[PDB]
Design a protein around this ligand. Structure first.
Ligand code: HEM
Ligand SMILES: CC1(C)[C@H]2CC(=O)[C@]1(C)C[C@H]2O
Length: 408
């Protein structure tokens, strides 16, 4: 049973579209495919759905890019739908606009900048190799449970100086953050609230212990960056460390599954990567263009007209980042991975002040994964008649990816 809200007076009927971000029409055929259905050749750049509490959806790449770049007009004070979940959401600095956002992003960048990330390459590689060598000779694996949900999680927990045995409870919190349970805005609000509380509970003692700490881990490094010449307050720290865990554990995991499904169905593309190692390295960004997973929102700051549509202060606009990288108006044949594509522009990492702090880590993880995978499992296919199971929400997910190959 679908929960509908009535449209507010300023939304005209001709812009209404019944789109459910948490269970997209056509989702069974794929998350990206399902979002692509929304983007028909004549659909308005902004449409409004009565589902998920009622909100706008930007349907074209340049709107998504522009909105992300314009925090003075589109605020991060709510970035989740439904509104109830967005209001309960308590992560730092994603809830902040500049200038409040700025010193916290600086602190994060101390830990996640490209030069710091580069130092991590061999640890990441070691982790990838160990996992791959566990099944490489077997000739088959369930990629989701045996790799994609394992590799990035071990990478991040090691980097964060946390026990790997916490992976399960943290993954469960992550699920209810990005894909909250419930068939009602209030239910989803409550699911998110409880998940966000679980993160704060887990994170509090770690913060207490590592303040002024000597540890070399990501959390200690970032925690002890001063904010305006003072220790980071408790309220902000809780939201900050929770966000690190959330990004580190429930992004790359999902990205990898979508990517691998595609690769397993395009052996020519895999062959190219194999034969030209530089095509692989330089081609990773094209993968990020093609396999966006995040759909989040911004809060309309003032009554305005935007791309010919009237918006009211407080309106939420969902930004399905897949609709930038896959916009046929930005990229010819957007659904094909072309490793040589010169223009790979996308909003997979969003834009503006909040542009993904973890993007260097994400790029390295994927680059290393592909290098060590192809070295040991050069050819592979999706099992005959296998059907991956897809989930849509603030972050997309996919499971059931049985791969098969002839051991080399
Ligand atoms: C496939 C990989 C990833 C994707 C697609 C992705 C996507 C995004 C997006 C779209 C945003 C902007 C959210 C918004 O403000 O509306 C973001 C921000 C952020 N991400 Fe990533 N992310 C990925 C990996 C990571 C990783 C591994 C981390 C490690 C901690 C991370 C940490 C962060 C942080 C801390 C922010 C907030 C930055 C700020 O508000 O200034 N991300 N990410
Ligand atoms: C939307 C995000 C992917 C982004 C901000 C969030 O809350 C995430 C779920 C983790 C971080 O990387």
């Amino acid at each position: 049973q679908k929960h509908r809200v009535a449209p507010p007076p300023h939304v005209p009927g001709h812009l209404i579209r019944e789109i459910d971000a948490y269970d997209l029409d056509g989702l069974e055929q794929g998350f990206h495919e399902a979002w692509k259905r929304v983007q028909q050749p004549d659909t308005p750049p902004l449409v409004w759905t009565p589902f998920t509490g009622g909100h706008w959806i930007a349907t074209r790449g340049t709107l998504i890019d522009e909105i992300y770049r314009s925090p003075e007009r589109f605020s991060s004070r709510v970035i989740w739908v439904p509104r109830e979940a967005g209001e309960a959401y308590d992560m730092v600095p994603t809830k902040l606009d500049p200038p409040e956002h700025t010193p916290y992003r600086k602190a994060i960048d101390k830990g996640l900048n490209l030069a710091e990330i580069r130092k991590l390459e061999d640890q990441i590689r070691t982790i990838a190799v160990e996992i791959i060598e566990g099944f490489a000779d077997r000739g088959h694996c369930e990629f989701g449970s045996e790799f994609s949900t394992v590799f990035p999680v071990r990478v991040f927990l090691a980097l964060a100086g946390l026990p790997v045995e916490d992976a399960t409870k943290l993954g469960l919190l992550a699920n209810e953050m990005t894909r909250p349970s419930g068939n009602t805005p209030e239910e989803q609000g409550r699911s998110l609230e409880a998940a966000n509380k679980g993160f704060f509970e887990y994170v509090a003692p770690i913060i207490a212990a590592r303040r002024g700490g000597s540890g070399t881990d990501l959390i200690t490094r970032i925690l002890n960056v001063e904010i305006d010449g003072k220790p980071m307050p408790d309220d902000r720290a809780l939201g900050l460390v929770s966000l690190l865990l959330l990004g580190g554990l429930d992004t790359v995991v999902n990205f990898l599954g979508f990517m691998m499904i595609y690769l397993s169905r395009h052996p020519e593309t895999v062959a190219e990567m194999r034969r030209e190692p530089l095509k692989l390295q330089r081609g990773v960004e094209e993968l990020f263009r093609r396999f966006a997973v995040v759909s989040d929102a911004r809060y309309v700051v003032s009554d305005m007209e935007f791309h010919g549509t009237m918006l009211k202060e407080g309106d939420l606009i969902l930004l399905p980042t897949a609709l930038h990288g896959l916009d046929d108006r930005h990229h010819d044949d957007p659904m094909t991975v072309d490793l040589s594509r010169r223009d790979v522009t996308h909003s997979t990492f969003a834009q503006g002040p909040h542009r993904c702090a973890g993007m260097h880590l994400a790029r390295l993880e994927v680059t290393v994964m592909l290098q060590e995978w192809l070295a040991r499992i050069p050819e592979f296919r999706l099992k005959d008649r296998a059907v991956p199971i897809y989930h849509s929400g603030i972050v997309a997910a996919v499971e059931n990816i049985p791969l098969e190959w002839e051991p080399q």
